Design a protein around this ligand. Structure first.
Ligand SMILES: *[C@@H](N[C@H](CCCCN)C(=O)O)c1c(COP(=O)(O)O)cnc(C)c1O
Ligand SMILES: *[C@@H](N[C@H](CCCCN)C(=O)O)c1c(COP(=O)(O)O)cnc(C)c1O
Ligand SMILES: [Cl-]
Ligand SMILES: [Cl-]
Ligand code: NA
Ligand code: NA
Ligand code: NA
Ligand code: NA
Lengths: 461, 461
């Protein structure tokens, strides 16, 4: 029943403003960390994202508390999740480390104040220039993804006379088929010879094995099975090769709740429901590692969990229309109420390209019943630019009183939402605002200007 | 049979270098307009796109020749397809007009030398500032997408005391449901009152009606049926309102061949096969318009057809690995040869997000049989960043002699491929090179630098 769907969604709405650590209401408006989001969107041009340093801190606390049973745990935020410098700074100030996924990500982590010993550099394509930059900066780990890349690591560490610290990425076949569907890592069967080669290299230091299971993983079993494979091989290689590993790096993949009404959801069928918590991830990993060693360092690489819940996208309702389907005799078959916001898939890419659900509310009318079925469209000149991941099918719920000028909020908009923006239609990539630990706001990324649209081009004026 | 697939693909390869108006071979390498693309990729850092001014000109000729039966045809390149200034300049110098999809697109079209009377501004969200800029610049057309937007056009044109020239966009119900699936335009039922209202406005001039059917449309029927609706309503409104329309704007959607072996394809099932040519589009449109008037101006808005065939993405094979699935006795079930190029979906977005096929060849070994099944991966730290739209399933064909350092070419890479790039993983958006009419090359867009990417951020140190 759609009445039951509407009732349930309004129960969720009420829970945002009465039972959510991030949110409040004031003057009829949604507030984030005490900041009125309607008011904030009158001071900065929409669309823009607003991040919460308090919520990032809460997320990091969940992750670290989860690993209390293993003292020697090192946490590296996967910076491909969000690398706006002010977000990286909040993460650095919250006391964890950083994982980087390109030369420029390494450089920005160093610039914002992560030390070399707080940085892991991962990748399937690490060109000589990338490896030379990483090795020269004394990174804590550079993963080894292939035998071809390892030849460059050997040659460049020799040229620099500088030790490269490495972890060998192994991707276990844990039942998709690994050889067909996992481009990353080496096969389990190649780990021994790879480690053998590294031991003999004068400037390459083997620190352990590495894996990464995936993203938004709704079950603990894959982490447990894959960690066991890497643990069993670590234990075996210690005996065969006569070494003691510094660490094991188990990657990321802790899910974030994108739908909260867990009683109504099956995470295995709809992974917008978070199937597990950080504690479940930690229990699975730590249990497997401790079957081998309790003293070894465990490295983790959470991305999504650090920032996903910690931002809201604010976008203004900028136009409206009613479209009507008529039958062949001119009688109404249905009306569709379209609301157009100033953010489309060029601003919130995963809503379109990855069928990602985010809660949508009228932030200007947050205490009003969301009692009208509407379709929510973006501003791109593209028939596919509307939000298909609705409350019911492709339909959302907003107050029937919704007006052009109101501010719509997408919740849980903090992971994989900034660097994935485009200038399609030459609409600018968005500004980003930060709410600090004191509840004060500041701009941390400007909106792309016109001069930004053309400065990259070379043309006679 | 896969031998037949391999034989067919190699026949296609031979037709590229011995049959295609764009390409030749020299020194074993793919040439585009006589430019050796292996050599070019040693002069500019990969990945980058190279555009051909000669091929843009050929595409425009096809479009304009198709409309020979209707002298008063005005052609507007849909600049959301590609708005790199050097590409826009080639299109301007080839003698056609420009359609724009945001305030900044209007501005860049004016900057590069399109006059106001050569610019159409379309959109579903045209905010007051957008409309004021457009009206102040005397645009040939601003479409009217909604009644709400029309109120701003009336108020702003009055404020400026400048006539706004408009076309009313009407989206016909041509049989899944226009009201549910088409966010753009007014309903046919609203056209009459909307036009009557415009006639009464002192600073708004009604030019005609507008539609746009869609993109990569593989049949002529949707264009004929939709044009007839617009033509019938135009003729009816001329009588009812006592006016003579300047024009009718029938939009874009002429497809481009992404697979060429039409004898093996069903365009209605796989629209990488172009189901129609520009001549088919023009026949359908012109036939319907001439049932009303032969003197009226027909406006068309081709995007994809102007540039799609006119660029190649050049990307270097930057790593390689073999993965093997073993049975439980250690015997080999299969091997997978992974080749990694330095372009992934952040560079060629539609290959991932829209399941778009592009021909892939080894440009460095273009005269060699492409006789080895490989999987082609990008450099992003994302298991999904590999090219799934293969020659057979997810598998591509390259010479068994392929080596790291070879240059891979993606053909037909000129539509919707530049502005859709991202800085995911902080890999830079690509440079762009142009081959001019004289066959000489120049950089027309730089690769994003480290600076460029961090300079939008506001941070302490
Ligand atoms: C990132 N995970 C990648 C990319 C996920 C999809 C992004 N649109 C994957 O292979 O799934 C990644 C992480 C962080 O993962 P989270 O899911 O915790 O954010 C950690 N380590 C590595 C090596 C990654 O690539
Ligand atoms: C463009 N309309 C889009 C094109 C597809 C975008 C895919 N990322 C659609 O969804 O139909 C457009 C054009 C040009 O269309 P082409 O297919 O010829 O490039 C012309 N007129 C208008 C009003 C458009 O929006
Ligand atoms: Cl840590
Ligand atoms: Cl023209
Ligand atoms: Na606004
Ligand atoms: Na060594
Ligand atoms: Na290169
Ligand atoms: Na008028």
């Amino acid at each position: 029943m759609t009445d039951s769907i509407m009732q349930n969604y309004n129960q969720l709405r009420e829970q945002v403003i009465n039972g959510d650590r991030r949110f409040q209401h004031k003057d009829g408006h949604l507030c984030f960390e005490g900041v009125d989001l309607d008011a904030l969107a009158r001071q900065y041009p929409t669309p823009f994202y607003v991040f919460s340093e308090p919520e990032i801190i809460r997320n990091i606390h969940e992750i670290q508390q989860a690993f209390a049973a293993h003292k020697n745990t090192k946490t590296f935020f996967a910076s491909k999740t969000c690398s706006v410098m002010g977000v990286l700074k909040a993460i650095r100030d919250a006391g964890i480390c950083a994982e980087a996924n390109s030369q420029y990500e390494v450089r920005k982590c160093l610039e914002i104040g992560f030390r070399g010993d707080q940085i892991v550099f991962n990748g399937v394509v690490k060109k000589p220039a990338d490896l030379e930059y990483a090795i020269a900066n004394d990174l804590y780990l550079i993963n080894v993804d292939s035998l071809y890349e390892l030849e460059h690591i050997d040659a460049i560490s020799r040229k620099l006379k500088k030790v490269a610290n490495v972890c060998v990425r192994v991707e276990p076949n844990v039942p998709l088929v690994t050889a067909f569907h996992a481009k990353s890592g080496l096969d389990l069967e190649q780990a021994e010879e790879t480690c053998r080669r590294i031991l003999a290299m004068p400037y390459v230091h083997l620190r352990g094995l590495h894996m990464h299971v995936g993203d938004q993983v709704p079950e603990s079993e894959p982490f447990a099975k894959a960690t066991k494979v890497l643990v069993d091989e670590s234990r075996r290689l210690e005996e065969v090769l006569g070494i003691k590993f510094d660490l094991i790096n188990v990657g990321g993949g802790i899910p974030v709740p994108y739908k909260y009404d867990d009683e109504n959801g099956d995470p295995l069928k709809d992974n917008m429901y978070a199937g597990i918590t950080a504690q479940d991830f930690a229990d699975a990993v730590i249990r497997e590692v401790h079957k081998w060693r309790t003293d070894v360092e465990i490295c983790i690489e959470p991305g999504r969990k650090v920032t996903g819940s910690a931002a809201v996208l604010l976008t203004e309702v900028s136009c409206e229309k009613r479209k009507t389907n008529y039958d062949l005799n001119g009688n109404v078959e249905c009306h569709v109420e379209w609301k157009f916001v100033d953010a489309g898939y060029s601003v919130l890419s995963d809503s379109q390209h990855f069928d990602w659900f985010f809660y949508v509310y009228n932030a200007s009318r947050m205490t009003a019943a969301h009692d009208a079925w509407i379709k929510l469209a973006g501003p791109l000149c593209d028939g596919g630019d509307y939000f298909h991941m609705g409350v019911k099918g492709e339909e959302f719920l907003l107050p029937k009183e919704t007006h052009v000028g109101d501010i719509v909020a997408f919740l849980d908009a903090g992971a994989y939402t900034i660097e994935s923006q485009t200038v399609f239609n030459n609409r600018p990539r968005t500004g980003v605002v930060m709410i600090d630990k004191n509840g004060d706001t500041r701009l941390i990324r400007r909106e792309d200007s016109y001069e930004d649209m053309v400065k990259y081009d070379i043309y006679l004026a």
